[PDB]
Amino acid sequence: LELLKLIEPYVAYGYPSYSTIRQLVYKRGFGKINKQRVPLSDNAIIEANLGKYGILSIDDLIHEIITVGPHFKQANNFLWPFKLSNPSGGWGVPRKFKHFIQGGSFGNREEFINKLVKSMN
Amino acid sequence: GKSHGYRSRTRYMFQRDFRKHGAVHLSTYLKVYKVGDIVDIKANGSIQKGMPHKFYQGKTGVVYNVTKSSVGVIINKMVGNRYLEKRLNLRVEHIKHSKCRQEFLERVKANAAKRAEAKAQGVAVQLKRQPAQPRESRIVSTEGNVPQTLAPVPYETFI
Amino acid sequence: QNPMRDLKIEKLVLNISVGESGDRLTRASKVLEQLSGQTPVQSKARYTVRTFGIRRNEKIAVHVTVRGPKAEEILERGLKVKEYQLRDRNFSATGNFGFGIDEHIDLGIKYDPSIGIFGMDFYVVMNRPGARVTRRKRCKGTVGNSHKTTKEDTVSWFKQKYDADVLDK
Amino acid sequence: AKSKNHTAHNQTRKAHRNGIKKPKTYKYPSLKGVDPKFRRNHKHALHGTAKALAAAKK
Amino acid sequence: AFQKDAKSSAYSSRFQTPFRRRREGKTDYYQRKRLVTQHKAKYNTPKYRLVVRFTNKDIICQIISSTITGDVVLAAAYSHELPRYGITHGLTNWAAAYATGLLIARRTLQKLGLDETYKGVEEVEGEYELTEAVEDGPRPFKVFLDIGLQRTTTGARVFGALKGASDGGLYVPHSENRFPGWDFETEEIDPELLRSYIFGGHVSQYMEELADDDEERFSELFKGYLADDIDADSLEDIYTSAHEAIRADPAFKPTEKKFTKEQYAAESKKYRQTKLSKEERAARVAAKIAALAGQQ
Amino acid sequence: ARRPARCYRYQKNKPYPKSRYNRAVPDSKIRIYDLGKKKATVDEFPLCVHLVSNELEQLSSEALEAARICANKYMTTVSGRDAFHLRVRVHPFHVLRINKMQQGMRGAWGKPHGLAARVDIGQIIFSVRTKDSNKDVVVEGLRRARYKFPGQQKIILSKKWGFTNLDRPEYLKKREAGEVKDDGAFVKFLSKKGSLENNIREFPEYFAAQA
RNA sequence: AAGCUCGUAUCAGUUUUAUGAGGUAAAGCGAAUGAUUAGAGGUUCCGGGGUCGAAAUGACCUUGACCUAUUCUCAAACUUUAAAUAUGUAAGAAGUCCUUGUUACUUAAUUGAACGUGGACAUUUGAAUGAAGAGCUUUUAGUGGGCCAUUUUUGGUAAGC
RNA sequence: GAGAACAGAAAUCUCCAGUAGAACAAAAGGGUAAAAGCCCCCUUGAUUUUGAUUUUCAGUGUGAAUACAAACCAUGAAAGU
RNA sequence: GGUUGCGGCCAUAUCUACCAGAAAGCACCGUUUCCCGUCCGAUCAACUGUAGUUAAGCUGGUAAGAGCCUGACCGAGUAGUGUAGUGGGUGACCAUACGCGAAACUCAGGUGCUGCAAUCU
Ligand SMILES: [Mg+2]
Ligand SMILES: [Mg+2]
Ligand SMILES: [Mg+2]
Ligand SMILES: [Mg+2]
Ligand SMILES: [Mg+2]
Ligand SMILES: [Mg+2]
Ligand SMILES: [Mg+2]
Ligand SMILES: [Mg+2]
Ligand SMILES: [Mg+2]
Ligand SMILES: [Mg+2]
Ligand SMILES: [Mg+2]
Ligand SMILES: [Mg+2]
Ligand SMILES: [Mg+2]
Ligand SMILES: [Mg+2]
Ligand SMILES: [Mg+2]
Ligand SMILES: [Mg+2]
Ligand SMILES: [Mg+2]
Ligand SMILES: [Mg+2]
Ligand SMILES: [Mg+2]
Ligand SMILES: [Mg+2]
Ligand SMILES: [Mg+2]
Ligand SMILES: [Mg+2]
Ligand SMILES: [Mg+2]
Ligand SMILES: [Mg+2]
Ligand SMILES: [Mg+2]
Ligand SMILES: [Mg+2]
Ligand SMILES: [Mg+2]
Ligand SMILES: [Mg+2]
Ligand SMILES: [Mg+2]
Ligand SMILES: [Mg+2]
Ligand SMILES: [Mg+2]
Ligand SMILES: [Mg+2]
Ligand SMILES: [Mg+2]
Ligand SMILES: [Mg+2]
Ligand SMILES: [Mg+2]
Ligand SMILES: [Mg+2]
Ligand SMILES: [Mg+2]
Ligand SMILES: [Mg+2]
Ligand SMILES: [Mg+2]
Ligand SMILES: [Mg+2]
Ligand SMILES: [Mg+2]
Ligand SMILES: [Mg+2]
Ligand SMILES: [Mg+2]
Ligand SMILES: [Mg+2]
Ligand SMILES: [Mg+2]
Ligand SMILES: [Mg+2]
Ligand SMILES: [Mg+2]
Ligand SMILES: [Mg+2]
Ligand SMILES: [Mg+2]
Ligand SMILES: [Mg+2]
Ligand SMILES: [Mg+2]
Ligand SMILES: [Mg+2]
Known part of the structure; x- marks a missing residue:
């Protein structure tokens, strides 16, 4: 929380639905495997590395992530930082670098993160 | 020209605390330091002999030596892009045992306990410190408590 | 009450203010010598006046502090000269x-x-017993008010024994 | 010909290029500066137990 | 006090009150700091002090150490213990000051082990000497003289105390030049005199010297010495045998007591006044604004 | 030779008072700060109107003095020297330097040149206390003074009794009870603190129920 | 640039927790020092003037000073209080305990101090996040005119100073 | 502050109050009240040997300083210094 | 619980004014042959504990007391401040956004806690 605090003017974030963690992992989900950034795309890629911890599928992954499981550090780090595109139909704001509250795009915009993250995914 | 003497800039720093001038109380001398002891450094102005330099004010180091009226404290001072080692010879009046480690030290004793308390039971421990978690769901009642509605207030002056 | 919160005389301190050092001052010491019995003490000028014709540390005067029965005698015998009539001043508020x-x-x-x-x-300095408290090395304390020497207290002390007058207003 | 006097500009830039190198700790630090009366005796003391722990292996 | 004197807010508000035990005019910290601080490399070694203090005629000898929680009495001998050993009179005097000290030396050197080893000087001829280390043995019990505010004068009896602890067996580092019969004008000690004082020669000699110059006073004081038929001469053996007796059983007996601690605690709250409740106080004020305001 | 005040409007530098370190500074042009019937009792002058700064800036000893003269002149002419109490609430303690002008900018530390009072936003500059039946004339007084100052200043009808610290009714409640007692031109208030004794000494009028 | 010794090790221009340090901003001035407006009540065998006067250590007015409780206003080189940012240390295997050797140091004392021997407790072994790893060595280039922005800020009326 | 012949604004004598408003060579700032100031007493440690340390720093020198070790002394009843 | 000797923290202990203090203890107090020190046996030194006293010291208690200590959504989320913007405004300056956050003030409560040893109706 204090980390986030420190980087509000440069990021956008909120609470993400099941719907959007799923379509994150399914579509742009990659593992860090001897670095190398390997695409998920088969369940054996996961069990291979996250299996140590329970977790032997793409949906096991998602689950451990959304429920913030006991092994979230391992689960979440396994996933390479997602690399999404620009929001499709734009940012909705005319000037990005303001708080969400002030009509701009950065800050905690809560459940409104999903609407965005989708457009950019 | 400029002036940069040993104690320069140290007006308020070596000053004495309000209504706390006078002798140093006798406990400052009964305390007992050993090697390896962590001490916090704060100069006492009334005591001129064996003062730390201003740089080492509010600094914390480790006892590496014990002499008749003094302890040798080693500090890591960093200069350039690196730390070098500094042995400071301090008088017992500019040193106090540090609390920087009692919480740890308290926590260990404590951890060893509820670990044997748990072992001798049926394992099941969890004893790393976790940080402040977000709070859980909860229900707030109205029995005795209906929300009072506030509005913003007009402009005024009183002057 | 009143037991021995009496009124003794602390000490008699006569002093001769000469304007100078030398023969005049030593003769004035000699006076206080064969009057007090005790070998007297000299005092130096504290600063310099030039119109009082004195230099700092000049040795400018003599005096002596006489206690006990001895004091009673001299106090008395000057009280003679003064025909036993003082003034409302003369008596400090202390x-x-x-x-x-x-x-x-x-x-x-x-x-x-x-x-x-x-x-x-x-100059007669007065006290009651237990003055020592404000005077000894250890536990140096202070005389309670109800024991401190008033001015009035002393004037009537003075009036009574001595059968002298105080005069003025 | 006056010129710039002094600045700290860009110095932390440089310190951080290659470090601020955490101070480097050793188990068994040195006795450098340790009171010699101590050290004199401490020598004989070790010598002692060394001798003992030799005689232990007989 | 006087009007013009009278302390303002500011005076009092900025006031740095001293250590209590200084306001009390009791403890001198400058000496204390230097009496007590130990070598930092001598770790939890206590620095034992020989406290000597004279009341208005009762001599106190304690051996103290310091603890940040508060000083610690190893052992204590008071000169009022001396009737036990055959001294009923003059318990503020030099020779009582000696005995008591001697007592405190024996008492603790006992409770420490070096009861038997380290007897000090049994003789006592006023010779100048501190107790020496035994060849292969435990070094003596070392103690430092806490004089307090006593003024060091040569002849003072604070040192009589000292010389008894030193004659006892204690190591109490010291010089001669403050013992009765030290020569101003030759670095030299007549011990024919300091012996006297130990045994009380000055007091006895005063007695014989008043036996026939003035008997009005010699009965006015030495009243006791009369009422118990102890004329001078005997006084040296009075003390000599106290010595004997002291070494023979220093072990300290406490008061028999009668009336429990609990009991003293009773008949004392009798005479202790009770602090008042703030409810009570406001009922004094309101009480007073009824009187002093409402036109009586 | 007096530099245009435009030169010193803003608080660009940090308080330069007259001091052991300063010393050689000129005197303040503004020197009387309480004009009008200043001897008057608190009860005599309930209405208090203010001249209030709307800017963080600096006012000269001169523009204080000028503006002082201006209002007091108006107020006495239209209501008499005893109709009001003018208090200047602001003292010019900040010394202004100048680089009098061999050489040019080498070592250019100024000499004292003049004084300003450094003033906040909302900071009161003038206060006036009268009887309400003089309002408009008092107000006009301050209005005319405004012209003598840079910056925007507001004039505010106060809520308080005179130069007193309590709004009129609060003062009233106290005064028509015991509480208030008269001083020079102020008032001493009954404390519920301190000695009971020399508390009824002062304020004999309190310590009574009704009337 | 050459590498070298190692490898999940150890590593951090970050947070968190625990414990220190600080005298800036603010604030304060019916708190010290130092400034500053106003009255009110005091006090003189005791600064000066005036009426009475033979004077008075006389009474009375009088303005000054000082005292008391109040009042408007200030401080880079004032201050009781005292932030925000920034800053020292600690968060374990180099750990915590127990059992009792060594010495010439040290103790009244095998007392202590230091260094050990022997034994008891494993990764929820002791916060977070991250780590295309960590440590170490040698050698050598260029450079040693800088300038700009937001914020803090000194001199200057000011400056694209 | 209040008191005492000559004696006055100021000479010397006494008592009360006194957080330091004094004094401590000197600039200023720290510091200090049974003292770090004032009076007295005894003195030469302002000495000997050769290292470590802190500030300035390249972690060179120089200056100044700190805590020890090994001597020899001073002073004190002593702990000490 | 009282008291004393040695204390720790060093005002909840200090300051001002009253009042109460049994018993013990401390004290004040008596004396000047002796050691010792003074202009002065006041301090300091000795001696008695005998001739005297709770007057003072000391301890405690009272006070819409001074001070000091503690608390609180009392003031004040104020002042100040880290972060943000192609925010406002000629400017001076000011709002807003995510954070941190005082001091005065006001009111309430309080007025030494306590260690070792000896002693005491
Ligand atoms: Mg779309
Ligand atoms: Mg569309
Ligand atoms: Mg489109
Ligand atoms: Mg646009
Ligand atoms: Mg898309
Ligand atoms: Mg400079
Ligand atoms: Mg240089
Ligand atoms: Mg003090
Ligand atoms: Mg020195
Ligand atoms: Mg009586
Ligand atoms: Mg002459
Ligand atoms: Mg050039
Ligand atoms: Mg240029
Ligand atoms: Mg250059
Ligand atoms: Mg006063
Ligand atoms: Mg007040
Ligand atoms: Mg001494
Ligand atoms: Mg600015
Ligand atoms: Mg400027
Ligand atoms: Mg030119
Ligand atoms: Mg010019
Ligand atoms: Mg110049
Ligand atoms: Mg205007
Ligand atoms: Mg006010
Ligand atoms: Mg500063
Ligand atoms: Mg400020
Ligand atoms: Mg403040
Ligand atoms: Mg301000
Ligand atoms: Mg002030
Ligand atoms: Mg400042
Ligand atoms: Mg940090
Ligand atoms: Mg990782
Ligand atoms: Mg790697
Ligand atoms: Mg290079
Ligand atoms: Mg080069
Ligand atoms: Mg060049
Ligand atoms: Mg930029
Ligand atoms: Mg100085
Ligand atoms: Mg002292
Ligand atoms: Mg020399
Ligand atoms: Mg060189
Ligand atoms: Mg060098
Ligand atoms: Mg009694
Ligand atoms: Mg004689
Ligand atoms: Mg006497
Ligand atoms: Mg005596
Ligand atoms: Mg009484
Ligand atoms: Mg007492
Ligand atoms: Mg009070
Ligand atoms: Mg800000
Ligand atoms: Mg902007
Ligand atoms: Mg604002």
Whole structure:
């Protein structure tokens, strides 16, 4: 929380639905495997590395992530930082670098993160 | 020209605390330091002999030596892009045992306990410190408590 | 109450203020010597006046503090000179009292034209017992008000024994 | 010909290029500066137990 | 006090009150700091002090150490213990000051082990000497003289105390030049005199010297010495045998007591006044604004 | 030779008072700060109107003095020297330097040149206390003074009794009870603190129920 | 640039927790020092003037000073209080305990101090996040005119100073 | 502050109050009240040997300083210094 | 619980004014042959504990007391401040956004806690 605090003017974030963690992992989900950034795309890629911890599928992954499981550090780090595109139909704001509250795009915009993250995914 | 003497800039720093001038109380001398002891450094102005330099004010180091009226404290001072080692010879009046480690030290004793308390039971421990978690769901009642509605207030002056 | 919160005399301190050092001052010491029995003490000028004709540390005067029965005698015999009539001042608000008398011959003491004539300040300091508290090394305390020497207390002390007057207003 | 006097500009830039090198700790630090009366005796003391722990292996 | 004197807010508000035990005019910290601080490399070694203090005629001898929680009495001998050993009179005097000290030396050197080893000087001829280390043995019990505010005068009896602890067996580092019969004008100690004082020669000699110059006073004081038929001469053996007796059983007996601690605690709250409740106080004020305001 | 005040409007530098370190500074042009019937009792002058700064800036000893003269002149002419109490609430303690002008900018530390009072936003500059039946004339007084100052200043009808610290009714409640007692031109208030004794000494009028 | 010794090790221009340090901003001035407006009540065998006067250590007015409780206003080189940012240390295997050797140091004392021997407790072994790893060595280039922005800020009326 | 002949604004004598408003060579700032100031007493440690340390720093020198070790002394009843 | 000797923290202990203090203890107090120190046996030194006293010291208690200590959504989320913007405004300056956050003030409560040893109706 204090980390986030420190980087509000440069990021956008909120609470993400099941719907959007799923379509994150399914579509742009990659593992860090001897670095190398390997695409998920088969369940054996996961069990291979996250299996140590329970977790032997793409949906096991998602689950451990959304429920913030006991092994979230391992689960979440396994996933390479997602690399999404620009929001499709734009940012909705005319000037990005303001708080969400002030009509701009950065800050905690809560459940409104999903609407965005989708457009950019 | 400029002036940069040993104690320069140290007006308020070596000053004495309000209504706390006078002798140093006798406990400052009964305390007992050993090697390896962590001490916090704060100069006492009334005591001129064996003062730390201003740089080492509010600094914390480790006892590496014990002499008749003094302890040798080693500090890591960093200069350039690196730390070098500094042995400071301090008088017992500019040193106090540090609390920087009692919480740890308290926590260990404590951890060893509820670990044997748990072992001798049926394992099941969890004893790393976790940080402040977000709070859980909860229900707030109205029995005795209906929300009072506030509005913003007009402009005024009183002057 | 009143038991021994009596009123003794602490000490008699007569002092001769000469304007200078040398023969005049030593003769004035000699006076206080053979009057007190005790070998007297000299005092130096504290600063320099030039119109009072004195230099710092000049040795400018003499005096002596006499306690016990001895004091009673001299106090008395000057109180003679003063015909037992003082003034409402003379008495400090703290309870002591002092008076002036010139011509030291005017109380016992012959003349001798080799010792000349001198004037003298008389100053009687008063106390009750247990004064030592405010005076000893250890546990140095202070006399409770109900024991401190008033001015009024002393004036009537003075009036009564001595059968002297106080005069003025 | 006056010129710039002094600045700290860009110095932390440089310190951080290659470090601020955490101070480097050793188990068994040195006795450098340790009171010699101590050290004199401490020598004989070790010598002692060394000798003992030799005689232990007989 | 007087009007013009009278302390303002500011005076009092900025006031740095001293250590209590200084306001009390009891403890001198400058000496204390230097009496007590130990070598930092001598770790939890206590620095034992020989406290000597004279009341208005009762001599106190304690051996103290310091603890940040508060000083610690190893052992204590008071000169009022001396009737036990055959001294009923003059318990503020030099020779009582000696005995008591001697007692405190024996008492603790006992409770420490070096009861038997370290007897000090049994003789006592006023010779100048501190107790020496035994060849292969435990070094003596070392103690430092806490004089307090006593003024060091040569002849003072604070040192009589000292010389008894030193004659006892204690190591109490010291010089001669403050013992009765030290020569101003030759670095030299007549011990024919300091012996006297130990045994009380000055007091006895005063007695014989008043036996026939003035008997009015010699009965006014030495009243006791009369009422118990102890004329001078005996006084040296009075003390000599106290010595004997002291070494023979220093072990300290406490008061028999009668009336429990609990009991003293009773008949004392009797005479202790009770602090008042703030409810009570406001009922004094309101009480007073009824009187002093409402036109009586 | 007096530099245009435009030169010193803003608080660009940090308080430069007259001091052991300063010393050689000129005197303040503004020197009387309480004009009008200043001896008057608190009860005599309930209405208090203010001249209030709307800017963080600096006012000269001169523009204080000028503006002082201006209002007091108006107020006495239209209501008499005893109709009001003018208090200047602001003292010019900040010394202004100048670089009098061999050489040019080498070592250019100024000499004292003049004084300003450094003033906040909302900071009161003038206060006036009268009787309400003089309002408009008092107000006009301050209005005319405004012209003598840079910056925007507001004039505010106060809520308080005179130069007193309590709004009129609060003062009233106290005064028509015991509480208030008269001083020079102020008032001493009954404390519920301190000695009971020399508390009824002062304020004999309190310590009574009704009337 | 050459590498070298190692490898999940150890590593951090970050947070968190625990414990220190600080005298800036603010604030304060019916708190010290130092400034500054106003009255009110005091006090003189005791600064000066005036009426009475033979004077008075006389009474009375009088303005000054000082005292008391109040009042408007200030401080880079004032201050009781005292932030925000920034800053020292600690968060374990180099750990915590127990059992009792060594010495010439040290103790009244095998007392202590230091260094050990022997034994008891494993990764929820002791916060977070991250780590295309960590440590170490040698050698050498260029450079040693800088300038700009937001914020803090000194001199200057000011400056694209 | 209140008191005492000559004696006055200021000479010397006494008592009360006194957080330091004094004094401590000197600039200023720290510091200090049974003292770090004032008076007295005894003195030469302002000495000997050769290292470590802190500030300035390249972690060179120089200056100044700190805590020890090994001597020899001073002073004190002593702990000490 | 009282008291003393040695203390720790060093005002909840200090300051001002009253009042109460049994018993013990401390104290004040008596004396000047002796050691010792003074202009002065006041301090300091000795001696008695005998001739005297709770007057003072000391301890405690009272006070819309001074001070000091503690608390609180009392003031004040104020002042100040880290972060943000192609925010406002000629400017001076000011709002807003995510954070941190005082001091005065006001009111309430309080007025030494306590260690070792000896002693005491
Ligand atoms: Mg779309
Ligand atoms: Mg569309
Ligand atoms: Mg499109
Ligand atoms: Mg746009
Ligand atoms: Mg898309
Ligand atoms: Mg400079
Ligand atoms: Mg240089
Ligand atoms: Mg003090
Ligand atoms: Mg020195
Ligand atoms: Mg009586
Ligand atoms: Mg002359
Ligand atoms: Mg050039
Ligand atoms: Mg240029
Ligand atoms: Mg250059
Ligand atoms: Mg006063
Ligand atoms: Mg007040
Ligand atoms: Mg001493
Ligand atoms: Mg600015
Ligand atoms: Mg400027
Ligand atoms: Mg030119
Ligand atoms: Mg010019
Ligand atoms: Mg110049
Ligand atoms: Mg205007
Ligand atoms: Mg006010
Ligand atoms: Mg500063
Ligand atoms: Mg400020
Ligand atoms: Mg403040
Ligand atoms: Mg301000
Ligand atoms: Mg002020
Ligand atoms: Mg400042
Ligand atoms: Mg940090
Ligand atoms: Mg990782
Ligand atoms: Mg790697
Ligand atoms: Mg290079
Ligand atoms: Mg080069
Ligand atoms: Mg070049
Ligand atoms: Mg930029
Ligand atoms: Mg100085
Ligand atoms: Mg002292
Ligand atoms: Mg020399
Ligand atoms: Mg060189
Ligand atoms: Mg060098
Ligand atoms: Mg009794
Ligand atoms: Mg004699
Ligand atoms: Mg006597
Ligand atoms: Mg005596
Ligand atoms: Mg009484
Ligand atoms: Mg007492
Ligand atoms: Mg109070
Ligand atoms: Mg800000
Ligand atoms: Mg902007
Ligand atoms: Mg604002």
